[PDB]
Amino acid sequence: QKTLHIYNWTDYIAPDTVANFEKETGIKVVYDVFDSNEVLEGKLMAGSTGFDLVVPSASYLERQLTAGVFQPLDKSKLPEWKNLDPELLKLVAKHDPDNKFAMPYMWATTGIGYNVDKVKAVLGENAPVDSWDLILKPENLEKLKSCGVSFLDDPEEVFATVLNYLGKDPNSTKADDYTGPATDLLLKLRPNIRYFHSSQYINDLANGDICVAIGWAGSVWQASNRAKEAKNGVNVSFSIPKEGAMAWFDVFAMPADAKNKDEAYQFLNYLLRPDVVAHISDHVFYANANKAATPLVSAEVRENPGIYPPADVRAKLFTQKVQDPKIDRVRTRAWTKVKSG
């Protein structure tokens, strides 16, 4: 008997991906889900997780690669590795030099999800839905306050987003940038933010309970699709703003103590087949990292510039740099101060 234990994000695979794989290979898949980088990272650090494959964000690889939790990927066992987009491989390679440990899986940005109808009512037909001004100017948040404003509970992405908006380095290594100008703007915005949460905005957007959110691209598009399936007339859309946004990448990695390496490699190469990962993108509304798969993705998804951004939008994206622990601790304390007062 052959078995394979996978640990992936919630809502990050198609409903029949595992079943198709099991039909094709005869391998028993045990599939478990998390919904936070810290829950996965806290299992990885305790060791002996029992997982053969896990899906961390690329920025979390650097911290974990120095701890020696993953083992290098045998490229010869992945003949379809050549299907991966080389540009995405280079961006992930900033956290994983020579792409030794991680296979790019899906990627997206952190932008603005919003209720199209609610925003136009409150802010007029010319609401700045293409700008962070929509959610980072107090004058606007005061108007959108009553219809619901939410921010991610993510100090790394929110501070980077605020810094970029103010004209600073999105990955500034200067402590005063976080406690000074970034905290000032966040404190001005705070009284108009209903909550800081990294998943409640999804269903809230879909149901009409909040009208604007800082959120992950594919999760906002899932909320938009949920409202469409529910036939509730709620029109959710998503915006990568003109000032740029953070792009991030989730990757498959193999723990060093994985018991089913052969089966793990079979599943990776399975994912590299163009139709397998195109099918996932169709259902989760995230762009996969496979360049051969792109034309196979449904037109509604691949021609959506908020999922597959064109070259001009990609040029405005920035990525997460791993900060020195000194700056991590400054970020956490300031975030706590922002969320309270």
Author numbering: 29 to 369
Reproduce the article's own wording on this structure.
To gain insight into the evolution and designability of ligand binding and specificity, we analyzed the homologous PBPs, PotF and PotD, which are Escherichia coli putrescine (PUT)-binding protein and spermidine (SPD)-binding protein, respectively. They constitute the first elements of two separate multicomponent uptake systems (PotFGHI and PotABCD) to transport the cationic polyamines PUT and SPD across the cellular membrane. Still, the protein-binding modes differ: PotF shows affinity for PUT and SPD, whereas PotD exclusively binds SPD. Prior to this work, we grafted the seven differences in amino acids from PotD binding pocket onto PotF; this resulted in PotF_SPD, which will be referred to as PotF/D throughout this work to keep naming for mutants more concise.
All prior observations combined led to the following three constructs: the basic double salt bridge reintroduction E39D–Y87S as well as E39D–F88A and E39D–Y87S–F88Y. The removal of this Phe should allow Tyr to flip inside the binding pocket to accommodate PotD-like positioning. We also introduced F88Y in the basic double salt bridge mutant (E39D + Y87S), thereby hijacking a bulky aromatic residue that already points toward the binding pocket to introduce a distal PotD-like Tyr. The highest affinity was measured for the double salt bridge mutant containing the additional F88Y (KD(SPD) ≈ 5.3 μM). To our surprise, all solved structures adopt a PotF/D-like semiclosed conformation. Also, SPD adopts similar positions to the one in PotF/D in all structures. In the highest affinity F88Y mutant, the newly introduced Tyr slightly rotates inside the binding pocket but does not directly interact with the ligand. It is involved in cation–π interactions with R91 and can stack with N65. The second salt bridge residue E184 interacts with D182. Whether all these constructs can completely close in solution remains elusive.
